[PDB]
Ligand binder design. Structure first.
Ligand SMILES: NC(=O)c1ccc[n+]([C@@H]2O[C@H](COP(=O)([O-])OP(=O)(O)OC[C@H]3O[C@@H](n4cnc5c(N)ncnc54)[C@H](O)[C@@H]3O)[C@@H](O)[C@H]2O)c1
Ligand SMILES: NC(=O)c1ccc[n+]([C@@H]2O[C@H](COP(=O)([O-])OP(=O)(O)OC[C@H]3O[C@@H](n4cnc5c(N)ncnc54)[C@H](O)[C@@H]3O)[C@@H](O)[C@H]2O)c1
Ligand SMILES: CCCCCCCNC=O
Ligand SMILES: CCCCCCCNC=O
Ligand SMILES: [Zn+2]
Ligand SMILES: [Zn+2]
Ligand SMILES: [Zn+2]
Ligand SMILES: [Zn+2]
Lengths: 374, 374
């Protein structure tokens, strides 16, 4: 039995930035009130986890990263009502407390209980459930899924279809929902419009899928890695262009291919140069540009306000605008009904112990999503 | 008889930046095909005209400025069908050709026939109708209303109710429609929401009226000139604050007054510092910020993308988002139906020949709108 007891298990710990993960023996405390301890089944490797390793995203170290995942409830703390032991669940990087200004606002999803803005690396009560070799280890985005077992706040855990294939649906926990929703909920892509998507990783390709689902007439996929073009076309892209093939800035090329600019542009990489190009490539009078990629810590874009005064709309969002706890199970239900597939996005499968190799694949550009199995 | 002939009349010519207008004799050529020659009746002094004088907005010189106005059609060129001699009309700083991508798009209004982006200072055919002292004089925003007579492209002339009081309705030609629409069409202010309006000139006060019409629960008026506060309250502002009274940055003061930030913020001044404060004062998860003011030429804002990634929407627009030719007459009709008044916005009336005194009033902060009569 494990309920009520400290669990001893394995987890991938990041002790220092720019260093490989270390598979360590860790201790996971039992869940407190309103907390859920989950046995991980599958976790996808998202560029966001990589940003901590590269130093592009600041969060307290040492830490157990991981946030795109699916697992089975091992035990629940007192007061928990939405999930029970044995339930299949997906942890959420942005919670849905259902009580704050944001959660009550039908148009927003950045719940005030998030640990995204100025990360503490703890659960919502301000404390940590992990220890390793006598040292406390921080949580990441309230989820810390690169561990055989994690403890998450109830409002950051979604109950899903009991028949869900966890090795596939874990992508719905972050990448797919974020990309797809950025097109459907945030930009609100219109039928017959023209779109441009910068970045063809798991999140960007999910945005291509969203643009297609919304009925876009044209979906221009932009990436410096042409090996991503076949998958982009498979998922809906009408055209694929590599900025390296051109002598002029990509935004000019895009405007000239689209009667002055796209109706909707998406940056799904995380670089200032592509965020600028994305904004510049949407039409000056009726374009909307959405930032999805996570930029390097404290780096600023230099913007002439005239770019917005003509009629542009520039916006950003986390999680594709989906209210997390209510939205993730619905996407799983759609998946179960075969409304969309995730196979094209999952290019590699590896045991959790090979987490480092999974990050090597991400770096090489050979993988879209590598899913790790526990 | 003037039809078909060159008209000799008085106009206010700007020969050099940062210099007073020169009231002098000019010649106005008859209208070409699809052009309309108008006898001016009233013109409002808008900060946009002043931006050319101060060098903050560039347009070819010498030039006849003026764009917020109302007059009577003196003659029309061949092919004109939407107006005829004797009709009361309002010239439009942004045309509505009705045939370009932007005009066809229901969500936009920055018609491709505009002379805003990189001005030519001509009518749509690329030529000028004005001469003075043996030399050609440039047009401004296709309207050049600081003249007893001007020639404007048909698609930039709106026919209005024949009983319209032109000394009042000229404001609908720019300032009122821009401010009001910025709240109603661009931001799409919602009933019960919280708003912050930076700048209480004719345009900003009109944005306050727009927020009230949309049903905002709170409208915080922001201005360093406390003498604009009485009018702001009269028109709907629930609270009025002066940044100069505070030690804390204004965006922080605003967030603390509104549970983390307003739902909708508007910058209606034209300064980079206030554009930044306006963006920062809207809630990070559900706020929308609209740029209305015209910023100084070639000056950029430094923006951390994380400001948008959390869920903010940042946008700009001209003319309050109204499609010019179809929209202005509807607003005049609403005015004639007593749905709104413009009296509070018109603080001074002077004859056209005293245009320089009118600009002195604007510079002094004593006036909201000064209307010049011909
Ligand atoms: N807003 C959110 O809620 C949210 C959610 C998940 C991920 N993210 C962010 O989304 C971004 C994408 O994540 P991912 O996992 O899909 O990443 P990924 O690394 O798998 O994909 C990035 C793609 O961008 C292309 N690319 C890189 N540099 C480029 C350049 N200079 N020009 C053109 N293409 C370039 C790469 O070849 C790759 O195909 C990351 O910044 C991640 O942190 C944000
Ligand atoms: N987007 C458009 O289509 C459009 C249309 C018309 C006008 N405009 C622009 O809108 C802006 C406002 O025009 P207006 O005629 O109402 O101008 P205005 O000069 O009459 O009013 C500006 C107001 O801002 C206040 N102010 C000035 N500096 C400030 C500061 N640092 N902090 C706080 N308040 C400050 C002033 O006291 C004044 O009350 C101008 O930039 C004008 O060019 C834009
Ligand atoms: C945490 C800092 C901002 C990152 C927002 C999205 C990252 N989440 C998942 O990839
Ligand atoms: C888009 C830049 C041109 C000035 C903005 C329109 C302001 N027009 C009238 O006041
Ligand atoms: Zn992620
Ligand atoms: Zn919440
Ligand atoms: Zn047009
Ligand atoms: Zn104006």
């Amino acid at each position: 039995s494990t309920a009520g007891k400290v669990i001893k298990c394995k987890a991938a710990v990041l002790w220092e930035v720019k260093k490989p993960f270390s598979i360590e023996d860790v201790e996971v405390a039992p869940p407190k009130a309103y907390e859920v301890r989950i046995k991980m089944v599958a976790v996808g490797i998202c560029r966001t986890d990589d940003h901590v390793v590269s130093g592009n995203l600041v969060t307290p170290l040492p830490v157990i990263l991981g946030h795109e995942a699916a697992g089975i409830v091992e035990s629940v703390g007192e007061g928990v009502t939405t999930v029970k032991p044995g339930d299949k669940v997906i942890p959420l990087f942005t919670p849905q407390c259902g009580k704050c200004r944001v959660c009550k606002n039908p148009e927003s999803n950045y719940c005030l209980k998030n640990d995204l803005g100025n990360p503490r690396g703890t659960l919502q009560d301000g404390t940590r459930r992990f220890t390793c070799r006598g040292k406390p280890i921080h949580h990441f985005l309230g989820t810390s899924t690169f561990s055989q077992y994690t403890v998450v706040d109830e409002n950051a855990v979604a109950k899903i279809d009991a028949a869900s294939p966890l090795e596939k649906v874990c992508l719905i926990g972050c990448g797919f929902s974020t990309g797809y929703g950025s097109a459907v909920n945030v930009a609100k892509v219109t039928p017959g419009s023209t779109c441009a998507v910068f970045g063809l990783g798991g999140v960007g390709l999910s945005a291509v899928m969203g643009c297609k689902a919304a009925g876009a007439a044209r979906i221009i996929a932009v990436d410096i890695n042409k090996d991503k073009f076949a998958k982009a076309k498979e998922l809906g892209a009408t055209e694929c262009i590599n900025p390296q093939d051109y002598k002029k800035p990509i935004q000019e090329v895009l405007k000239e291919m689209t009667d002055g600019g796209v109706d909707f542009s998406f940056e799904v990489i995380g670089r200032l140069d592509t965020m600028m190009a994305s904004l510049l490539c949407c039409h000056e009078a009726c374009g909307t540009s959405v930032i999805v990629g996570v930029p390097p810590a404290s780096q600023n874009l230099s913007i002439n306000p005239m770019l917005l005064l003509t009629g542009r709309t520039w916006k950003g969002a986390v999680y594709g605008g989906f209210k997390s706890k209510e939205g993730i199970p619905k996407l799983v239900a759609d998946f179960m009904a075969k409304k969309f597939s995730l196979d094209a996005l999952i290019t590699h499968v590896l045991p959790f112990e090979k987490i480092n190799e999974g990050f090597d694949l991400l770096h090489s550009g050979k993988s879209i999503r590598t899913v790790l199995t526990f």
